[PDB]
């Protein structure tokens, strides 16, 4: 369901400043997760296209919406990894 993914990513992209080392590490796990989501959706869409090749239902278009969202999520997380690096650089800079 679209809103579930929206909510899940919203939780995922948050960065806990107090635990930056964990967050840097966990970011790769997040990437794996959304890569799996993204990947599975492609499989579902393929199955529909295989079944269609048998010859009202907006299914395929709906999966497409999820697929694009997961693309955005993958982008967001890749971006998140960078933010963590940026934050550490700023911390280092602010010190002597």
């Amino acid at each position: 369901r679209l809103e579930d993914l929206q909510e899940e990513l919203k939780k995922d992209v948050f960065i806990d400043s107090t635990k930056l080392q964990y967050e840097a590490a966990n970011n790769v796990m997040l990437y794996s997760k959304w890569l799996n989501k993204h990947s599975s959706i492609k499989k579902e869409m393929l199955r529909i296209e295989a079944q269609k090749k048998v010859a009202v239902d907006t299914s395929l278009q709906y999966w497409g919406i999820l697929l694009d969202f997961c693309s955005g999520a993958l982008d967001a997380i890749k971006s998140r990894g960078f933010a963590i690096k940026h934050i550490q650089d700023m911390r280092a800079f602010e010190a002597g």
Copy 2:
């Protein structure tokens, strides 16, 4: 959604607080999530409208498209905002 609400919201969102750069870098990912949800949600609504149709209604569809395009731009802006924060830090480090 009202366009002007989104316009004003983005205008507030892209502001960069020079004094709180670490926060801004982390928060940028969250902003990306928010507008991604907006963009994502608009597509779902447009799908629903086209599904329900399957004269007044085909105007509505055109209006959401305007909102969809605005959110596309917002995602670009926010992505771009993230880069600016990195650019600003590099300049600061350079100046030292």
Copy 3:
């Protein structure tokens, strides 16, 4: 909106102050928002005019719309220039 007003406005906006490069990087995103709003608002009006019709004026808004597209391209390009200028500064040092 008047076309020449946008022309003068973009012309002022794209200027880059080298002495305040950090500000310019941040404000560039803000400029993008501003012109993104202009572009966005023009489309709504064109939708309203075509809806009321459902055509010379329509054409004029199109010109303003096309210009705002250009502004957005310019502002995007401006952001890159600012990074490029920094890269040049760092290198020469």
Copy 4:
């Protein structure tokens, strides 16, 4: 406008002064604005002419000028990258 003037103007404009690379990078955006204004003004004039005609410099001549400005806009866009490349080359030859 005379075509030959625009030709000459652009020829001067696309030149890159390597000795002032930072200035050229910044000013290129200003150049884009300039030609965007030219291009924009021509469309308006052609619109004015088509309107006056629909009530009853040749329309065709403006088209020649309009197209030139398109090419010009293309040239200035390309130039920003050309400018980037000169810097890249410097970094490359420096091994840095």
Copy 5:
């Protein structure tokens, strides 16, 4: 290959053991090799399938697309592992900084 097998394999792989950071840094390259081999082999199999079909056609289903899904996934995996390497460095910079 099954997609779900690849999904699970990567999920196990990207985990970072903080207690063995030096090992993880070294082994990360090995993971890249492993997934590059997966990616590479899938491409070879896809070539074999497409070639045998284009020989039969000259003389005269969803498989090939499914491999494509696996192929694209392995790209992501390779990207993730490249990313894992950076993450490990980031964590080390952080360890050093906090001291």
Copy 6:
């Protein structure tokens, strides 16, 4: 070249001997040279084949349209694709080895750190 041979070779190559970190740092460049030579040579072969393809294409044009004095295209573009697979693999190999160079430094930074 056989793809599986390259797969196996890279797998041996990217291994890092923790006990000989300085040697590994030095040898990594040597490895880079090795795969760069592979990558480079594959491009040369692909160039030879692409020339063969442009001749086969003309032969095919002449065969139809009734010219000549007195199958091949499909074979050539298959070979070409196989070499393409090896080429892509070697790109990845170069990435891996570049990455291996960084890993070695990262490990040393960690050792120095752990040394108080």
Copy 7:
């Protein structure tokens, strides 16, 4: 230049003598410079070859069609739609465009060489740091 000569040359160049590490660091700069020059020369050569290619293309197109001067002409009356295929297979065009592509390969190899050498400088620094570390 022959590709295999470059391959052999780089292989010799990137070797690191641990006993003369400061020297290797200084000479690494010279190596980069050396390969930067190869790269620079190759660009000049390719630019020259492309000119030769534009002369071969004009000469062969005149040969395969109706030309103003010339006596030896093609008895295969090739049409405009066939001309790209015919030109790409022509002995002279093919020879010139292979050389060009070959030089392009040499250019790419030198890019790679520059990457390797840049990397070599860091490897040398890393090794010195390690030695200092095991010492202190």
